[PDB]
Amino acid sequence: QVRWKIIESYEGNSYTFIDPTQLPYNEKWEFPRNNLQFGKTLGAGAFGKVVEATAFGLGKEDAVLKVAVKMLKSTAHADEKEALMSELKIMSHLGQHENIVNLLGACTHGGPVLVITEYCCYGDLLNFLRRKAEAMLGGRPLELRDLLHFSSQVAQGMAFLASKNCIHRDVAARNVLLTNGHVAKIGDFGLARDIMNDSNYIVKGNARLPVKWMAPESIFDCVYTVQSDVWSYGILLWEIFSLGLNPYPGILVNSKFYKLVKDGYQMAQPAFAPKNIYSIMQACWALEPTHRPTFQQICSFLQEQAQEDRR
Ligand SMILES: Cc1cccc(CN(C)c2ncnc3[nH]c(-c4ccc(CO)cc4)cc23)c1
């Protein structure tokens, strides 16, 4: 599936004390439903939708501020309701981070469940990159430092998720939002996503899966770990440094594609990727999951590349 999920892991430095999806919910997040006014839809899919809203008296500082609200369609089945409560429980457990779309509140009584999160004013990274690529063909252009920042910001978010044993399962430039200062943030964006009508999501029987982004062990063996997410981050880095090309350009998803990937096929270096950045992608794409870098290793290598650019 493409929802965030806490996994049980002791390998290395992580320690699972509790799975927050196993327990009911923390009523500290409750917020008055009548103190939201809804605006336009930011996105929608099969069972859910996200709308921008103003929240009146949210948090200790009693601020008025613009937020995003996630909710199910009235047509949603119980399993969809459960999945939303699960996401709320995970987000209540993770704690805040600058590169996550943070939870701010929920409304879980007196009507349908609303999940209130930070609002990101610049929209998705992929469309941002594609507009900056388009501009080159006919304001200010991107620089290497901007692409390094985006890469670092996402890797810091992912390093945070990894430290809490949270797997993402849909890492892709389309699932990165940009907020004030064009800082990147990640979140579980499944509800905003029209997955059933998106050709990037391939039928795999029960499921619709972002196969071009997925580790071989995820595709073949239904294994889903942090190191699976590392593979996907490599695909994302390719998207960033290509200014938003579609992965595996012109290659159809089918049996030849699965065999390519299993046999060690890797996308070519993007035009705007330095060799050192391509080396991150190649490492993320190690066929053996244990030979891939950790998100912390990625973060600390990217921080060196950033210093070099600054010099
Ligand atoms: C990844 C993705 C893609 C589409 C919709 C969403 C909705 N969500 C969860 C959001 N969650 C939080 N903040 C948000 N800000 C926006 C947003 C979308 C477009 C634009 C116009 O450029 C601006 C903002 C979507 C959003 C998320």
Residue numbers in the entry: 547 to 684, 747 to 919
Quote what the paper states about this structure.
The colony-stimulating factor-1 receptor (CSF1R) is a tyrosine kinase embedded in the cell membrane of macrophages. The receptor is activated by colony-stimulating factor-1 (CSF-1) and interleukin-34, and signaling via CSF1R is crucial for the differentiation, proliferation, and survival of macrophages. Unlike most kinases, CSF1R and other members of the platelet-derived growth factor receptor (PDGFR) family contain both an activation loop and a juxtamembrane domain (JM domain). In the autoinhibited form, the folding of the activation loop prevents the binding of ATP, and the JM domain forms bonding interactions with the DFG aspartate as well as other residues in the cleft between the N- and C-lobes of the protein, stabilizing an inactive form.
A protein co-crystal of CSF1R in complex with 23 was obtained using a sitting-drop vapor diffusion set-up. A complete 1.9 Å data set of the CSF1R/23 crystal was collected at the ESRF synchrotron radiation source (Grenoble, FR, beamline ID29). Inhibitor 23 binds via two hydrogen bonds to Cys-666 in the hinge backbone of the kinase: the pyrimidine N1-atom accepts a hydrogen bond from the NH of Cys-666, while the pyrrole NH donates a hydrogen bond to the Cys-666 carbonyl oxygen. Additionally, a water-mediated hydrogen bond is formed between atom N3 of the pyrimidine moiety and Thr663. The methylbenzene ring points toward the C-terminal subdomain. It is sandwiched between Leu-785 and Ala-800 and almost perpendicular to the side chain of Phe-797 from the DFG motif, which adopts the “DFG-out” conformation. Although the inhibitor binds to CSF1R in the DFG-out conformation, the ligand does not occupy the allosteric pocket that is formed underneath the αC-helix when the kinase adopts this inactive conformation, as is typically the case with type II inhibitors. Instead, the 3-methylbenzylamine moiety of compound 23 occupies a hydrophobic binding cleft formed by residues Leu-785, Ala-800, and Phe-797 termed the front pocket. The methyl group of the aromatic ring points toward the C-lobe of the kinase into a small complementary cavity in the front binding cleft. Thus, compound 23 cannot be classified as a typical type II inhibitor as its binding mode resembles that of a Type I inhibitor. The co-crystal structure of CSF1R and 23 reveals that the benzyl group of Phe-797 is folded toward the glycine residue.
